[PDB]
Every structure is written in structure tokens, then in C-alpha cells.
Amino acid sequence: MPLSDTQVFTALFVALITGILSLRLGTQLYK
Amino acid sequence: AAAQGLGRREAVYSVLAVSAGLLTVAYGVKGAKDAKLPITVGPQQPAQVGPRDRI
Amino acid sequence: ATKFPKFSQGLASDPTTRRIWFGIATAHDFETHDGMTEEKLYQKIFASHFGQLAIIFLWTSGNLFHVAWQGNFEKWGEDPLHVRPIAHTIWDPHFGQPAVEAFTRGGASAPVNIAYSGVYQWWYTIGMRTNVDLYNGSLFLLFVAGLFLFAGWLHLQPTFAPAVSWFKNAESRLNHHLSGLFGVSSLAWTGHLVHVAIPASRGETVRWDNFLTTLPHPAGLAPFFTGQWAVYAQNPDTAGHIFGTSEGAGTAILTFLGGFHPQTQSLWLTDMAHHHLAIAVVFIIAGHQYRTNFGIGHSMKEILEAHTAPSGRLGAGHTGLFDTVNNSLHFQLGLALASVGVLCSLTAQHMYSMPPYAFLAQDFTTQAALYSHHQYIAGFIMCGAFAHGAIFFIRDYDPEANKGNVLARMLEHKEAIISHLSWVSLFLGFHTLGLYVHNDVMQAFGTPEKQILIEPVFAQWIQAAQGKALYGFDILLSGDNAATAAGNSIYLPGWLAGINSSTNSLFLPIGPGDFLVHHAIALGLHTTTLILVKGALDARGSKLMPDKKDFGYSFPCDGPGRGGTCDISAWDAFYLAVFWELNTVSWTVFYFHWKHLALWQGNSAQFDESSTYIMGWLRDYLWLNSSQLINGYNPFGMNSLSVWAWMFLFGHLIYATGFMFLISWRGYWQELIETLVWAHERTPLANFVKWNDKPVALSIVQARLVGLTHFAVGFVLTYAAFVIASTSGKFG
Amino acid sequence: RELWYPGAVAPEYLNGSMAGDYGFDPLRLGANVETLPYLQEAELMNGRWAMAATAGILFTDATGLPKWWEAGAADYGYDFQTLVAFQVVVMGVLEAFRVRGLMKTPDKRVKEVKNGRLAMVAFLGMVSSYAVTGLSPLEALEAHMANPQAVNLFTSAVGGESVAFIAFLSCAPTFLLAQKTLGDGKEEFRPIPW
Amino acid sequence: MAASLLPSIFVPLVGLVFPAVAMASLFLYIEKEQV
Amino acid sequence: SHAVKIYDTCIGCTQCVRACPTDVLEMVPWDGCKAGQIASAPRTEDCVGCKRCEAACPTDFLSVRVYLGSETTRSMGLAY
Amino acid sequence: DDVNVVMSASNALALYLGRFVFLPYQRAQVERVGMPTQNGQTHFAAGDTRAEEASFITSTNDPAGFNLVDVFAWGSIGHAIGFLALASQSAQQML
Amino acid sequence: KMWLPAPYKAPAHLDGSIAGDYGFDPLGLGTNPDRLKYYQEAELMNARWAMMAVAGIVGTEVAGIEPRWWEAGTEDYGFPPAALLAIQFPVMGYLENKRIQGWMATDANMKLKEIKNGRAAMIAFVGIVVQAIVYREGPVAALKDHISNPFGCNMATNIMNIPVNL
Numbered sequence A: 001m002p003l004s005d006t007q008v009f010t011a012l013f014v015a016l017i018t019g020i021l022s023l024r025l026g027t028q029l030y031k
Numbered sequence B: 001a002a003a004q005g006l007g008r009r010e011a012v013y014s015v016l017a018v019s020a021g022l023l024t025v026a027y028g029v030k031g032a033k034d035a036k037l038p039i040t041v042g043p044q045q046p047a048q049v050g051p052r053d054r055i
Numbered sequence C: 001a002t003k004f005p006k007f008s009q010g011l012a013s014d015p016t017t018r019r020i021w022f023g024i025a026t027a028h029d030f031e032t033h034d035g036m037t038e039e040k041l042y043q044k045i046f047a048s049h050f051g052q053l054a055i056i057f058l059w060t061s062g063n064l065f066h067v068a069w070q071g072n073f074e075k076w077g078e079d080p081l082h083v084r085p086i087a088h089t090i091w092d093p094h095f096g097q098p099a100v101e102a103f104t105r106g107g108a109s110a111p112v113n114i115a116y117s118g119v120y121q122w123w124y125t126i127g128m129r130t131n132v133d134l135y136n137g138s139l140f141l142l143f144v145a146g147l148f149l150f151a152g153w154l155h156l157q158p159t160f161a162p163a164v165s166w167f168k169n170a171e172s173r174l175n176h177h178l179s180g181l182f183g184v185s186s187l188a189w190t191g192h193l194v195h196v197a198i199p200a201s202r203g204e205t206v207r208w209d210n211f212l213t214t215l216p217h218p219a220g221l222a223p224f225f226t227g228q229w230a231v232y233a234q235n236p237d238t239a240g241h242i243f244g245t246s247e248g249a250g251t252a253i254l255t256f257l258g259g260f261h262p263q264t265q266s267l268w269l270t271d272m273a274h275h276h277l278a279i280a281v282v283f284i285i286a287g288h289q290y291r292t293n294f295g296i297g298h299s300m301k302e303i304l305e306a307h308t309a310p311s312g313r314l315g316a317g318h319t320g321l322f323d324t325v326n327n328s329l330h331f332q333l334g335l336a337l338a339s340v341g342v343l344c345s346l347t348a349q350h351m352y353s354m355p356p357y358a359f360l361a362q363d364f365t366t367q368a369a370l371y372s373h374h375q376y377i378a379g380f381i382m383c384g385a386f387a388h389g390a391i392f393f394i395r396d397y398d399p400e401a402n403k404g405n406v407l408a409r410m411l412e413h414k415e416a417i418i419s420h421l422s423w424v425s426l427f428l429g430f431h432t433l434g435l436y437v438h439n440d441v442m443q444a445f446g447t448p449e450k451q452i453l454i455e456p457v458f459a460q461w462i463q464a465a466q467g468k469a470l471y472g473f474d475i476l477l478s479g480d481n482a483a484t485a486a487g488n489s490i491y492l493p494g495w496l497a498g499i500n501s502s503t504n505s506l507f508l509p510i511g512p513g514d515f516l517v518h519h520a521i522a523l524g525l526h527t528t529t530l531i532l533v534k535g536a537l538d539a540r541g542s543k544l545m546p547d548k549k550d551f552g553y554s555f556p557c558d559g560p561g562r563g564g565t566c567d568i569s570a571w572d573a574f575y576l577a578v579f580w581e582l583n584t585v586s587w588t589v590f591y592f593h594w595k596h597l598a599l600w601q602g603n604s605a606q607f608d609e610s611s612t613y614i615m616g617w618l619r620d621y622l623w624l625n626s627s628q629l630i631n632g633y634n635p636f637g638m639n640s641l642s643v644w645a646w647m648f649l650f651g652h653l654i655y656a657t658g659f660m661f662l663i664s665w666r667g668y669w670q671e672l673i674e675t676l677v678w679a680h681e682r683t684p685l686a687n688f689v690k691w692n693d694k695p696v697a698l699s700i701v702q703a704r705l706v707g708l709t710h711f712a713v714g715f716v717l718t719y720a721a722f723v724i725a726s727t728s729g730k731f732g
Numbered sequence D: 001r002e003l004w005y006p007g008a009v010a011p012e013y014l015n016g017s018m019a020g021d022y023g024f025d026p027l028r029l030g031a032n033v034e035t036l037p038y039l040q041e042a043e044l045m046n047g048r049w050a051m052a053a054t055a056g057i058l059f060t061d062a063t064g065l066p067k068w069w070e071a072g073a074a075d076y077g078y079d080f081q082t083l084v085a086f087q088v089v090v091m092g093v094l095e096a097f098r099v100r101g102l103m104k105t106p107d108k109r110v111k112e113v114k115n116g117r118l119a120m121v122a123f124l125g126m127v128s129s130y131a132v133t134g135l136s137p138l139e140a141l142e143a144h145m146a147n148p149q150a151v152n153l154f155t156s157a158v159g160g161e162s163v164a165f166i167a168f169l170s171c172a173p174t175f176l177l178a179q180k181t182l183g184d185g186k187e188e189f190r191p192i193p194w
Numbered sequence E: 001m002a003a004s005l006l007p008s009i010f011v012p013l014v015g016l017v018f019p020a021v022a023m024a025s026l027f028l029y030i031e032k033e034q035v
Numbered sequence F: 001s002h003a004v005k006i007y008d009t010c011i012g013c014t015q016c017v018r019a020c021p022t023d024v025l026e027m028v029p030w031d032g033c034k035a036g037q038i039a040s041a042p043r044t045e046d047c048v049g050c051k052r053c054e055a056a057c058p059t060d061f062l063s064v065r066v067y068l069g070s071e072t073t074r075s076m077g078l079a080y
Numbered sequence G: 001d002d003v004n005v006v007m008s009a010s011n012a013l014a015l016y017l018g019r020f021v022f023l024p025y026q027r028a029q030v031e032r033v034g035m036p037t038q039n040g041q042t043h044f045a046a047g048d049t050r051a052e053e054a055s056f057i058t059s060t061n062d063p064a065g066f067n068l069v070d071v072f073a074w075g076s077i078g079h080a081i082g083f084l085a086l087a088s089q090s091a092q093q094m095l
Numbered sequence H: 001k002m003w004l005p006a007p008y009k010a011p012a013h014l015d016g017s018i019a020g021d022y023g024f025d026p027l028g029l030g031t032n033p034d035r036l037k038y039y040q041e042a043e044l045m046n047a048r049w050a051m052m053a054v055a056g057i058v059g060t061e062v063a064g065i066e067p068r069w070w071e072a073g074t075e076d077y078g079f080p081p082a083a084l085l086a087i088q089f090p091v092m093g094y095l096e097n098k099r100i101q102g103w104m105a106t107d108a109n110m111k112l113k114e115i116k117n118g119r120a121a122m123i124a125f126v127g128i129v130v131q132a133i134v135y136r137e138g139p140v141a142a143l144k145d146h147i148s149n150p151f152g153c154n155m156a157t158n159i160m161n162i163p164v165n166l
């Protein structure tokens, strides 16, 4: 059974939020 | 007049960012298929099984 | 000045391209940064650890997502032995139609890569069955990675940022890591195995939906709390048990059968659950050793202080080492790397012989790839451990504080250690190479019976002690005495079935070729250790350069005076030892791969015949097994091994380019760049564009590193391509 | 003045001078001073076109004319090539005049701004509702009003995506509050540097 | 639908677009004068 | 630039000064040695780091030492 | 009940053992072995405020100062011994 | 006065100023004052939510609307869970954002009574969850079974008899 498109896009949006948080951590490290 | 708004560097930065987004979207949606790339065309062939009968 | 070396003024004002290179290179060397306090050092290290842990979890979530989305995990689970795992879909615009039609393996409708990382066998063994389970896991690890990124961000704020003393609290950290990071984690994994992985292995799917409704054992927790723990081992899985089905499926959740599950040729999952449970108990007990906040426990400083040999053979004992370890981040890093590299070697050496994952032993390419992976990682980690110890000796070692302890004693008899390392290395290399050359000549001269074939009777005697009945010593487990009688209650029938079988690699038969290659391995380990220990102990100074500690860890040289001092730094000792590390690891994994290929074709006699002389390795292993690899693409089309052929040649390219940086040195290249600067400055229509940074040749240390990196990259990629392509061409 | 959430901090270059300024620019697209009037005028244009589009979609739908997505295929007096030539010429002339006027250069302004903003949201809604359900805006509204509890975006084919996005929106300002009270708010980088 | 669309978009996004922006951005920062 | 240090073991043989290709080193009066003179490094900014002074120093261990540090144009020895 | 008798008895036995036999030795050892110290001073004395010693560890009316942490340590030991005995006994019975 | 008998002396960071202060910080979590205040607010919140949860569960079970509270999510209200999250998250985000801004902007007997009943409700909710896990009867029914057969129905027996009632 393949993954539903909603599943893929929800995981991808969670990834986008994780990436935002990674940018926040990188900026905080750079200070 | 043809380069009226582009004389600013940051205007060029916006142009190139938008162009990058539109070209990648169009390539992944329509451009690749239009160019008849082999990757976009399906395998359209019977598959082969590796040794130890491993598909 | 520029902003990129924000942490280095001295690099910010550098007017050359060396600025960019050294700002890249010295970015993670926090200790040498401008205006860097110890508190900022420790906080930044803590947040970087958070960061790359989040990187690890995102990598795992990515693997899970790609297997769930583009893989064939369900179909592979249906037929594990006749389905090639899928790693991820390929969308390459550069592929031709034959490439698209040749990379479509598995049941994919798109070009794919065949997952050689074993993640399929691992995820099938832990109870994951469907793409939905893998997707749920990937999403959960995405959330975990976001949580750790937020935690790093939070503990970088001044309110939540911890002081130095929080990091220096050794007792609390080790108590919590032993009990909770190790022990409770192992307990939770046991709970997973008992509740999910074992029932999934016996056919019933236990997910969160039907979790809390299906008891993992027919009896509840009554046998647990009433102390009748042997009820959980009452009815193990039958020998004729098919994995993932209920045929011959037992009810026991925890046991110590030993050996391997006959249908999967891997460890019994009940054994591995009982295993993680026992570890959990031992480590939870162990994590109460040290004293934190409750008036009980040991003090590590006083443990070290009281362990001094009364006769004074060790000097002042360990007096003063607690502060040495705790204040030295490089000492701790060297210890952690040493241990981690030993563990990685142990994983390589235990996963091939004791496969913990169902249907992993039958997939030979994955076994070879995993062994090579972990051995090369282990060798690099070992080189790092020794390098960081040299760094500890330079930056963090205090001779006044460490006066009289074992460490200062190491400094005092360093010459003896280095000289005996040189002796053992010279003996091993002389005699191993001589025996190999002798065997080469005897085979060449048509008289192979005159070869010096030393039977490795000591390793064979160990195997006989451990249950192997081939050689006939029959002493400890092969014989009939007290040790075997004690063993024959729980584990030993399965262990003896596993070890005396010709199919598995639990304890392979040993011959004179195995003798010679293990002595080659010993040569490699002794020589790499020679170079690295020499670098560490002469890091602070030697007779050629007494004041080496004043020049830092990594400097080019001390000039051509005093005869010449090229490669005199401890960094340069590391750089030299990485070559020997790559050489040794290659020897080990060549041995592994050839012995296993002979086993997998069913003719172990090939290795046992041709491993005693170097031409046999060059012909019957390298030349013989490179045939299908180099034929990945040719004028008559291409096949699925064309990518590995391209990577093989790719790694050859990188290896050679590395040779350029290693052999030719800076000063030829500097003058060449000077002529190029003149040319660009005097070229019409090109002088309109001018460099911001003055172009200069790579510095001596930089280029030594660049060449070493190219050497190692080409080494690893060439061998990865070889070990995967040959094994997949012969076995899939 | 009220910002884009209770407790928000307006960017320093968003001081309420422009119409509809709610201090919303997380990605700092209008941070550059010289492009900010251009971005204002891009907002006003996209809003105006969305307003005209919303009117021409809703009236067309409610008057029984062909559906907005189907309206291209209808048989018109002029074929595609001549129509696009007409469009190219007249819109080029009109946009040249608009550009030169822009180069030359309260209540009602704010009104227009808000209206355009709603329109762009409403037009995106119409396109998304058609792409997901295949129902025109008035049909989609009737379907929603028939069964409001279960017929919605968050129960459609992209339902979980929308639920996750609304969760992100609901949990963003709380994290921004932590960032303000714990961090110094001294970011040297902007999400769009140019 | 994800399988037929997302690879053809994200492979150029990660292998041509993101590299270009990242290299340009890093260049602009590294060559950015300290003041 | 680099760092050049002169230590009191210097005998004032002047060989470091004569060996310097950028005129970094000079001899100054000093009562510590028999010869009555110690080297010094006033023009440290001009030190390319070639370490000819260390090669020409007879004293064991060296009385002049060059420690490579921040690299400037002059230290890198660039004509461009 | 067999498990209850052997277990409770064992745990209490271990508690008593800690209270009288090895209590003087344990207290002498914690006197001899000071609090953990970093750079010559305790973690709390060096700034680790989270290494502040607890207060309930001395609030005890026991003649020998058998605090709550001593109770928990010796009860753990007794539980480990008892469950080892139960587990071993079950092996000897049914295996 | 204190969670331990009279020769117990509270740690310094718990001086008794807050309501329901019995000097129970054996781990020393509330040593930092600003974190102690954040934890005071977190206790108040988790407590109030535990009270609401226990009161709602007992109401729905005694009056019989929803027995076996744990499957209330599966029950059909006509309004599916996805849109329920979609409407809850904005409203609850608004309420919690307003509350936290109020908290950051800033009778003792009543406050002490509240905090004590909160700690009790926290314990009660934990007990409800674990009993529901191990016994699969509703809380009031679990109470009734304990009253009828205290030695036949308790943790030391329900753990012994998971397989027979599940």
C-alpha cells in the first residue's frame, strides 16, 4: 500500500517546520 | 526602459529568485516531460531479476 | 577585513584565499576562537551536540520516509529472499533510456537504488511490516529532531544556558547516562521487543491501536511479580518456525536459546529481548555507583586518588588524573573516540558472524557493505582518538599538576614505548612480507608444497575451546568437562549447532592464509599505533624540536634548518598514520570479503589455497572479482552495475588527485599562481574583473589535509564500489 | 495599533505608516527600504485583480454562466491568438502608463488594502476548493451549509495538511513569545536577506 | 499526487536551485567587508 | 604578522641578522653575553617566516625563534 | 504465600543488615571519601547550583542515622537478592 | 507544615511564601526563582486541567452518558476529529496566549485549598489512567468493585489478573 499524498505532504510540512527550527538554532549558535 | 527596474541589484536578486522558482516548478511539472527526458518516460520494459532470484 | 572569520580576527584581516580555507577549517575548533571563554565553549559544544543529534534523527527519518514512500518494504517482507530492497527512487535528468530501463529493479515502476544498508532486515526484525509503520516512524523522528533543535536553541538562551560546573559534574552525568541513557533505554527496547517485535515475528501485528489489549505473554505479569520468571521461557519458538507467521510459533517472550533462528539464520528475538533486559538491569544498577545529591555513592576523584601501587612501580598512581580528564575536553574526546571506534569494530566483527536481523545472512552484499562500513568508520574514529590525545598533550596537559602520575611516567619512558612499537612493527612486517614473498616464489617456481604454511593452531585451539569440533583439540566446550556441562543447560546446544555449521560465519575455519593475514593485520595495527603514539608522546617536544608545545597542534614545519623538519608536528603524525590506518582496514576487509566470497560460492578451498601468496590475492580475488564490476558499462550497452563502475573509476580519480597534493608541495604552485596572477592582470577584457582575495597556493598543512582527504575519499569510494558491485553481480 | 497577533512586535520598518500595516513580515521581504514601495504596489495590484476576479467569478456562478474554470473553452467571437494579441497590446500600453505614473509618484486606502487582501485569500480559496472537491464556489458553499460539521477543508483530501498548518499557526506566536522573553531579539540575519 | 510530481521538482530544487542560492549567499557573506 | 622572539642564550654572533632576507632582526648592545650584543626583532611586521635566522643560529637550543601567526600580505611574501 | 514470605523477609533482612552490620563501614567510607569535587572544590561550591545537596537525607530519628536514601538503597539490594532467589529457584524447578 | 516529620528542614529556595508550600523539592528543581515561578504556574495549569478531567469523567460515568471514558474520541458526535483539531487549535491558542501574557504581565487559604485539590486531582487522574489500562472498567465502577471485594479487586490483584479481564 503506497503512502497517501496527505501523509507525504504532512510529513513534508513537519520537515519544513523542523528546518525553520534548525535555522533558529544555527542563528543562535552563530551569536 | 527595458532595464528600468533592474538597474538595482536587489531587484535583480528578486528577479533571479523568482526565475529560479518558476523555472524549477515548470521543469518539474511541464518542462521535463516536454523535453521527453528518458527519466520522465517510464521504464516501459519487462523487469529483470538479480542473482539468487532477487528481484 | 571581512566578516566570514567572525571567530578569528587574524583570519579576517588575511588578504588571501587562505582566509576562506582556514575559516572553513577552524570553524569547529572552538577553543582557539577570539574572546572565547570556557563557559561559551561548553555551551556551544552542548548546542552543537544537540544540532548533530537532530541531524542523526533527520537522517534516520529520511531513510524511513524514503523506504516507506519509494521502497518495496511490504513486498520484500512477503518474499525476503527473492526481493531486492529498494533504497529510494532515482530522478536523474542525465539518464538515457537504457539507464532508466536497467536501474528499474524490485517491483518499482521507476529507476531505484537497491538498499544495501540492511535497514529492511532491521525494520522487519523490529516488527515494522508496512509502509504506514515506516511513515509513522519517520514522522515521529521528524518531531524528535525538531524537539532537539528547539532544545539546543533553548539551552543557548542565558536563562537556560548551563554553567561550566554543570558540565564538570561527572558523577551526575555518568549516573544518569548509565541508568537512564543506557539502562532505561535498553529496558524500553526490551518492552518494545516483547510487546511488538516478537508478536510481529509470530504473526500477530501489535501496533498502538491494539497495544494495551494483546498481552505479550499468555500469562500476564503474574509470573513476573510472583518471581516465577521461568514461565516466560516455558515454550520457545520451534525450529521449524517461519518468521512473521504462526507456524511453529512459541509463547515464550524471554529466553537464552542461543545460536540462530533456522529459517532466518539470525538471532532469536526472544534471546535478544532477554539480552536487552539483562543489560537494562545491569546498567540501571551500575548507574547508582556515583554520588550526586543524596549522600551515598562514590567520588571519582577519590577513586583515582586511592589507586596508587604501594611499591611505587606506577609512581604516584592516578593522583591528579580526575581533574586532568574532567578539565580536558580533548582527553574526554580521545577516550570517547577510542571506545566508540572499538565498539564500531565490535559491531563489524559481530554482525557478520552473529547476524541480529532476519534474512540478513542470506543477503551477502549487505553483510559485506556493513562490515566494510563499520571497519572503515572504526579506523577513522581510532585515528581521531589518537589525534585528540596528541591535542590533549599539547593544549590540555599540565606537567606540574600531572607530576608523578602514570601520564608523566608515559612521558618519561616514551622512548621505550616508541622503540618497542618500532621493533614489533619491524618484526611483523619483515616476517609476514618475507613469508608472503617466499610463498609467491614457490608458487611461481611451480613447487607450492615448499611454501611456509604456518598452521594458526592458537586461534584454532580457541575455536576448539569455544565449541568448534573441526580441529579435534576438544578441550573446553568441544570436550566433555565441567564448563560444557554447565553450558549445556541453556545456551550450548544452539551455540554448537551454529558454530559447527558450514553455512554461517559464526567461527569460520582457519588456515595458513588466515595466519598470514592476521599477522598482516597485526603489522598494520602495530604500525598505525606506532605512528599515533609517537605523535602523541612527541607532541610536546622531541630532540629535533624541544619547544613543539609552543607551536600548537598543527604547524607546517620548523624550517629546513637542523637538517630539515618536514612533517614534524603531531598533526603530521596523524596525517601519516591515516595512510596506515586505511591500509590496515583495507587488509582486514579484503580478508573478510575474500573469505566470505569463497564461503558464499560454496568453495572455501579457493581462499584457503590462494590466500597464502600475494599473487593469489591479486589474481583470484581482485582481478577475478573485478570482471563484472568493470563491465558495468561498455560499448555493448550498460547494466545495473554501471553506477558502481563509474564510482570505482571515480574513486581511482580522487585517489590519484590526492597523490598530487601529497607529492607536489607548495612553492612550485605558489610561483605558478604568481605567473597566473600576472597573466590575469595583463589580459585585456579580463582585468575588468578582479579578485577580492589574493590568490595563493594551498598552505602546507592545508594541502597535506586536502591530499589526505582525497586519498581517503578515493580509497573508500573505490572499495565501496568494488565490494558492492562484485557481491551484487554474483549474489544480488 | 493592533498587530497580526496579540503580543506581536512590529518590524522597525513597519511603523504603521502604510495602509493596512499590521506589522506582519516574518520573512522581511519589505525590509529593504527601496523595494518596499514596489511591494506595496504589488500588493495593491494583486489585491485589485483578485477583487475583480472574485466579483467576476461569483456573479458568473450565480447567473448560470459557464464555470470559471470552464469559461476558457466557451465559443467566443475571437479566437485565442487574436484575443491574446489584443490582451498583449492593450495591457502592455496600460501597464506602461501605470509604470510611468508610479515612477512619477487613509480610510479609503486602508479599505482598498483590506478588500484586496480578502479577495486574494478568497480567490486562493476558490482555486483550492475546485482543485480538491471539484465544486464551484456557490456549490461549495451550499455543500458546506448542508453539512457544516463534516464537509470542510480539514475533512477533504488535504485535511491533515490543513490541520497541521493550523496547528503551526496556533503554536507560532507562543514560540515567538518565548523567543522574545528568552532571546535578545538581536538577529543579524533576515529570512530573505535582499 | 506526490510520487509523479515531487521528485521532478525537488531534485532540481536541491541540486541546482539550493546550491546556487547557497553558494551565492555564502560568497556574498565571505567577501562582505568586516565593516 | 608572525612573531619572532630572541632569548638570552644569544651570543651576539649576528648570523640571524645577516641571514634575514627582510631586515627584521637587528643587533643591540647587551651586557648578558661576552660579545656584548643581543639580537632583537623591531620590524616584526616584515617577517616572512622563512626561518633563516633559526637555521643560522649556532646556539643550542635556538636563541631566535619564529612562530607563524596571522598571515598578512608582507608575511605571505606576495608581489601582488 | 511463598513469594511473599521469601521476598518480604529478604528485603527486611537486607534493611537490617544495612542498618547495623555495614552501616558503620558505609558511614566511615563516606567520611573518608568526600563529596565529589571539581578543581579542588565541590560541584555546588564551584557553581553547579543543580548539585545542591538535598535536605531530606539528614532528617532522620534513627539512632544510627539510617536516612530515607539508606532505606531506598538497602530495600533495592533486598529486592535484587529476593528476585534473584525467586528467579534462580524457578530455573531449578521447571528447567 | 512539612512533607516530612519535625526534624525535616526545608531547602532554602522554598521559604513558605507560596501557597501549599511544604518544602517538597527533593530534587531541587525550583532553586532558580524565575523557574520556580514558571513551575508554580505550570502546576496551577496542570492541576486545573486534572480537576476538570476528573470532574468530567466522574460526571459522565455516574450519570451514565459516557462509560469507559477512554473511548470518547471514538464516539460519533457528527463532528469529525480533524476539523475538531482545526477549530480547537486557534481558540485554545488564543486562550493560552492571553493567559500567558497575563502571567508574564504580573485569600491565601483559598489559594492553598486550590493547589492542594490540584495535587489531589493530578494523583487521581494518574490513577484513573493506570487503572483503566490494567482493569478496563470505568473509574466509578472500579471504585464499586473495590468496595464490594477489596482484596479481590486492587492493584496487587488486578496486575495478577490482567489476562482474565482483558
Ligand code: CLA
Pocket (backbone or CB within 6 Å): A011, A012, A015, C055, C058, C059, C060, C061, C062, C063, C065, C066, C070, C088, C089, C090, C091, C142, E006, E007, E008, E010, E011, E014
Ligand atoms: C537527511 C535525510 C535525507 C536524505 C539524505 C534525503 C535524500 C533524498 N530525498 Mg528525502 N526527505 C527527507 C530526508 C532525507 N532525504 C525527509 C525527512 C523528508 C520529509 C518527509 C524528505 C522528503 C523527500 C521528498 C518528498 C522527496 C525527497 C527526495 C530526495 C532525493 C533528492 C532530492 C532532495 O534532496 O530533495 C529533498 C527534499 C527536501 C524538501 C529536503 C528534505 C530533507 C530533510 C528534511 C532535511 C535534511 C537536512 C540534513 C540533515 C542537513 C543538511 C545540511 C548539510 C549537511 C547539507 C534524495 C534521495 C526526492 C526524491 O525522491 O527524488 C528522487 C523527493 O521527491 N525527499
Ligand code: CLA
Pocket (backbone or CB within 6 Å): C045, C046, C047, C049, C050, C053, C122, C166, C167, C169, C170, C172, C173, C174, C176, C177, C179, C180, C181, C182, C185, C343
Ligand atoms: C536519564 C537521563 C539522561 C539521558 C537519557 C541523557 C541523554 C543524553 N545526553 Mg545527557 N545528561 C544528563 C542526563 C541524561 N542525558 C545529566 C544529568 C547531565 C548533567 C550532568 C547531562 C549532561 C549532558 C551533556 C553535557 C551532554 C549530554 C548529551 C546527551 C545526549 C547524547 C547523545 C546520545 O544519546 O548518544 C546516543 C547514545 C546512546 C543511546 C547510548 C550509547 C550506547 C552505545 C555507544 C551504543 C549501543 C547502541 C546499541 C547496540 C544499538 C545500536 C544499533 C541500533 C541503532 C540498530 C543524550 C540524548 C550530549 C548532548 O548535548 O546531546 C544533546 C552532551 O553534550 N548530556
Ligand code: CLA
Pocket (backbone or CB within 6 Å): C024, C025, C026, C027, C028, C029, C030, C333, C337, C380, C381, C382, C383, C384, C385, C387, C388, C391, C553, C554, C571, C574, C709, C713
Ligand atoms: C565526536 C568526534 C569528534 C569531535 C568532537 C571532533 C572535534 C574536533 N576535532 Mg577531531 N577528529 C575526529 C572526530 C572528532 N573531532 C576524527 C574521527 C578524526 C579523524 C579523521 C579527527 C581528526 C582531527 C584532527 C587531525 C584535528 C581535529 C581537530 C578537531 C577540532 C576542530 C575541527 C576543525 O578543524 O573544524 C572542522 C573540520 C573540518 C571542516 C574539516 C573537514 C574536512 C573533511 C575531512 C572533508 C571530507 C570530504 C567528504 C567526506 C567527501 C564527500 C564525498 C565525495 C564523493 C564528494 C575539534 C575540537 C583539529 C584541531 O585543531 O583540534 C583542536 C585537528 O587538528 N580532529
Ligand code: CLA
Pocket (backbone or CB within 6 Å): C421, C422, C423, C425, C426, C427, C428, C429, C430, C433, C523, C527, C530, C531, C576, C577, C579, C580
Ligand atoms: C608497501 C609500502 C610500504 C612499505 C613496505 C612500508 C614499510 C615500512 N613503513 Mg612505511 N609508509 C608507506 C608505505 C610503506 N611502508 C606509505 C605510503 C606511508 C604514508 C606516508 C607510510 C608511512 C610510514 C610511517 C609514518 C611509518 C612507516 C613505517 C614503516 C615500517 C613498518 C615496520 C615494518 O613493517 O617493517 C618491515 C619493513 C619493510 C617491509 C620494509 C622493506 C624491507 C625489505 C623487505 C627488505 C629488503 C631486503 C632486500 C635485500 C632489498 C634489496 C635492495 C637492494 C637493491 C639494495 C616499514 C619500514 C614505520 C616505522 O618506521 O616503523 C619502525 C613508521 O613510523 N611508514
Ligand code: CLA
Pocket (backbone or CB within 6 Å): C089, C090, C091, C092, C093, C094, C099, C113, C642, C643, C644, C646, E011, E014, E015, E016, E018, E019, E020, E022, E023
Ligand atoms: C555529469 C553527470 C551527472 C550528473 C550531474 C548527475 C546528477 C545527478 N544524479 Mg546521476 N549518474 C551519473 C552521472 C551524473 N549524475 C552517472 C554516470 C551514473 C551512473 C549510471 C549516475 C547514477 C545515478 C544514480 C544511481 C542516482 C543518481 C542521482 C543523481 C542526482 C543526485 C541528487 C542530488 O542533486 O542530490 C544533492 C546532491 C548531493 C547530495 C551531493 C553531495 C556531494 C557534495 C560534494 C558533498 C559535500 C558538500 C559540502 C558541504 C559543500 C556543499 C556546497 C553547497 C552549498 C553548494 C543528480 C540529479 C541520484 C538521484 O537522482 O536521486 C535523487 C541517484 O540515486 N545518478
Ligand SMILES: CC1=C(/C=C/C(C)=C/C=C/C(C)=C/C=C/C=C(C)/C=C/C=C(C)/C=C/C2=C(C)CCCC2(C)C)C(C)(C)CCC1
Pocket (backbone or CB within 6 Å): C330, C331, C332, C333, C334, C335, C338, C342, C382, C385, C386, C387, C388, C389, C390, C392, C393, C536
Ligand atoms: C593518545 C592519547 C589518548 C588516546 C589514546 C588511545 C586512543 C588509546 C586506545 C586504546 C585502546 C583502543 C585500547 C583497547 C583496549 C582493549 C582492551 C583492554 C580489551 C580487553 C579485553 C578483555 C579484558 C577480554 C577478556 C575476555 C576475553 C579474552 C574474550 C572473552 C570475554 C572476556 C571478558 C573473558 C588519551 C586521550 C587516552 C590520552 C592522551 C593521549
Ligand SMILES: CC1=C(/C=C/C(C)=C/C=C/C(C)=C/C=C/C=C(C)/C=C/C=C(C)/C=C/C2=C(C)CCCC2(C)C)C(C)(C)CCC1
Pocket (backbone or CB within 6 Å): C281, G011, G012, G015, G071, G072, G073, G074, G075, G076, G079, G080, G081, G083
Ligand atoms: C516504623 C519504624 C520502624 C520500622 C521501619 C521499617 C520496617 C521500614 C521499612 C522500609 C522498607 C520495607 C523499605 C523498602 C524499600 C524498597 C524499595 C526501595 C524497593 C526497590 C525495588 C527495586 C529497586 C527493584 C528493582 C528490580 C525490579 C524493578 C525488577 C527487576 C529486578 C529488580 C529487583 C532489580 C522501626 C520499628 C524499625 C523503628 C521505628 C520506626
Ligand code: SF4
Pocket (backbone or CB within 6 Å): C556, C557, C558, C559, C560, C564, C565, C566, C567, C665, C700
Ligand atoms: S615543509 Fe617544505 S618548507 Fe616547510 S620545512 Fe619541510 S620542506 Fe622546508
Ligand code: SF4
Pocket (backbone or CB within 6 Å): F009, F010, F011, F012, F013, F014, F015, F016, F017, F038, F039, F056, F057, F058, F059, F062, F063, F064
Ligand atoms: S640569535 Fe642565534 S644567531 Fe642571532 S645572534 Fe643570538 S645567537 Fe647569534
Ligand code: SF4
Pocket (backbone or CB within 6 Å): F004, F019, F020, F021, F022, F023, F024, F025, F046, F047, F048, F049, F050, F051, F052, F053, F054, F066
Ligand atoms: S623568519 Fe625569515 S624574515 Fe622573519 S626573521 Fe627569521 S629570517 Fe628574517
